[PDB]
Every structure is written in C-alpha cells, then in structure tokens.
C-alpha cells in the first residue's frame, strides 16, 4: 500500500486531514475553555 499512502500524502487529502485536525483542536479547546475573549488564565 505504498501507492495508497502516496495518495493520502496528496495536497487535498493532507489538507483535509490537517484542517480537520486544526478545526477539531480549536473546537475542543472552545468546548473545554468556552468563550475565550482574553488571555487571563
């Protein structure tokens, strides 16, 4: 499955995975630390 993992390394798939990751990280940060208007913690 060298070719399949080459496909997963393509720009659109890697972009989808990375932005799902970034968006999920931000979403979980905003779930556990809701409404962060200022850096106070």
């Amino acid at each position: 499955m060298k070719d399949f993992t080459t496909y997963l390394s393509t720009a659109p798939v890697i972009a989808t995975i990375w932005f799902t990751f970034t968006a999920g990280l931000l979403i979980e940060i905003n779930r556990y630390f809701p409404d962060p208007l200022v850096f106070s913690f």
Binding site: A11, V38, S40
Partner: protein, 165 residues
C-alpha cells in the same frame, strides 16, 4: 479609567446585558418540562452565560456605556492597567504560531528544492519530512534570528526583475 471606560464589574449596563440574556434563555426554558433534553441544553447555556460574564468581569475587562468589554491595543496602557492579556499577550502568542507555520513551510520548500522533481513533492507532501520540520519548528524565532544574522535568510540580487528594474 483609561478612555472613560468603566470596569465591567462596576458597569450596570453589563449586568443588564447579563440578566437580559438570561431572561431570553429562561423564557425559552419555560416552554419545556423539568429535565427535558431542551431543558438540559438551556440550563447548560445559562450556566455558560453566567460563567462567561463572571470570567469577563473577573479578567479586569473595561466596558463602555453599552456594557460591552472593550480591548486595549496599546502596550503601555495595557501593561500599566493590567490589560496585556487582551491584545498584547495574544499578539506574541499569535506571532509565535504564525512564524511557526511560515518557518515550517519555508524549511519544507528549501528541503524539497534539492530533489529532482521539487514540484511533485509539493502536490504530494513528504509527510515524514513535513512532520520532522513541524516538530523542530518550535524554535522558529531563535533559528530565524540566527538565519537572519548569517545573511542566509535573504536571497541576494539573484531574484528576477522586470526590464525597468
């Protein structure tokens, strides 16, 4: 007392806005039974609202006549009156991450410039190389300063230019 802005802990419009939002939420809550799924949701929303207001008033935020928190962008006013976490601290917090992204992408470009087909290493990402550089880009400010002082961050006049220079 920076620009006629009162603290949100002392402003009455801020408390008015809090009770207004809570009144909206409880007027929605009156329609459902004691512990419904909507009732649970609205009680959680009310708790989040009260917590948000308490946490903004606790953070020393300044409020206007509308009772809304106003941020202080100026360093010197933010650092004199304890408003550095509004715009000043998150400024460097952002710049760290943005230089992180830029430095990592730069290092990836420079690393794949050496290959025979550098273009196919840009539509098909070298994921191990990219992850190595993403991990070691945490020290991007120091590495960028040291690459700036060697004269190797910039290219010389090998960049291309139009005929009238």
């Amino acid at each position: 007392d920076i620009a006629g802005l009162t603290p949100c802990s002392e402003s009455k419009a801020y408390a008015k806005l809090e009770k207004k939002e809570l009144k909206t939420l409880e007027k929605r809550l009156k329609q459902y039974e004691a512990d419904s799924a909507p009732a649970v949701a609205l009680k959680a929303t009310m708790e989040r609202t009260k917590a948000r207001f308490a946490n903004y008033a606790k953070a020393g935020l300044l409020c206007g006549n509308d009772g809304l928190p106003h941020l202080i962008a100026d360093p010197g006013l933010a650092l004199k009156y304890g408003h550095a976490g509004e715009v000043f601290i998150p400024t460097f917090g952002f710049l760290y991450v943005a230089g992180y992204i830029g430095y990592v992408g730069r290092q990836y470009l420079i690393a794949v410039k050496g290959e025979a087909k550098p273009t196919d290493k840009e539509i098909i990402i070298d994921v191990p190389l990219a992850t190595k550089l993403a991990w070691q880009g945490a020290g991007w400010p120091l590495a960028a300063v040291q690459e700036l002082q060697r004269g190797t961050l910039l290219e010389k006049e090998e960049n291309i230019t139009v005929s009238p220079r």
